[PDB]
Design an enzyme around this catalytic site. Sequence first.
Site, mmCIF file in Angstrom:
data_model
loop_
_atom_site.group_PDB
_atom_site.id
_atom_site.type_symbol
_atom_site.label_atom_id
_atom_site.label_comp_id
_atom_site.label_asym_id
_atom_site.label_seq_id
_atom_site.Cartn_x
_atom_site.Cartn_y
_atom_site.Cartn_z
ATOM 1 N N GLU A 148 0.852 -1.271 0.141
ATOM 2 C CA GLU A 148 0.021 -0.017 0.077
ATOM 3 C C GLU A 148 0.793 1.265 -0.093
ATOM 4 O O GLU A 148 0.560 2.458 -0.305
ATOM 5 C CB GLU A 148 -0.731 0.017 1.115
ATOM 6 C CG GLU A 148 -1.870 -1.112 1.329
ATOM 7 C CD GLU A 148 -3.005 -1.003 0.240
ATOM 8 O OE1 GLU A 148 -3.185 0.110 -0.324
ATOM 9 O OE2 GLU A 148 -3.812 -1.789 0.242
ATOM 10 N N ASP A 193 -6.465 6.508 -5.080
ATOM 11 C CA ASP A 193 -5.996 5.120 -4.801
ATOM 12 C C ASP A 193 -5.935 4.791 -6.374
ATOM 13 O O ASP A 193 -6.312 5.459 -7.430
ATOM 14 C CB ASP A 193 -6.781 4.260 -4.068
ATOM 15 C CG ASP A 193 -8.079 3.783 -4.258
ATOM 16 O OD1 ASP A 193 -8.553 4.252 -5.303
ATOM 17 O OD2 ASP A 193 -8.700 3.208 -3.456
#
Length: 164
Positions: A11, A20
Amino acid sequence: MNIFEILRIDEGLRLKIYKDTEGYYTIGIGHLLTKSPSLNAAKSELDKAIGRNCNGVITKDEAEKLFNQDVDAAVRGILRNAKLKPVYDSLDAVRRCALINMVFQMGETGVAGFTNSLRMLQQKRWDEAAVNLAKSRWYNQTPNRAKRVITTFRTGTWDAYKNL
């Protein structure tokens, strides 16, 4: 290697709001803020999550705080899910990390939907499950990350993240 470290790798860490891979407002270590297109909506959810007026930015500690909460939530979600718990309980410690990583990324609901693959993991047919898991939107969208999880389930080792 543990879950925190593996997830920190998959991440990243961002201290400012960012989009994202699906275009959603996120901050920290994969902490989704909102699926809405409004930055204000996001800054609003941000300040609510942190308990202060952040103006779209947080500190490392604050990120780590969200991260512990999110991991905790993932585990708990697995434990309370009728489709997931049994799989998780059947698995070894390394493989358990792989399942948690998918749930953190895609939610319990999304994972609970890999019926065929879950069954295969449960039966410990590693090779078969790896192939089945690759036949998914998940894999096509985030292939490098998906390969890492998949090899983890296939080999039962942390070799895919040992390079990294």
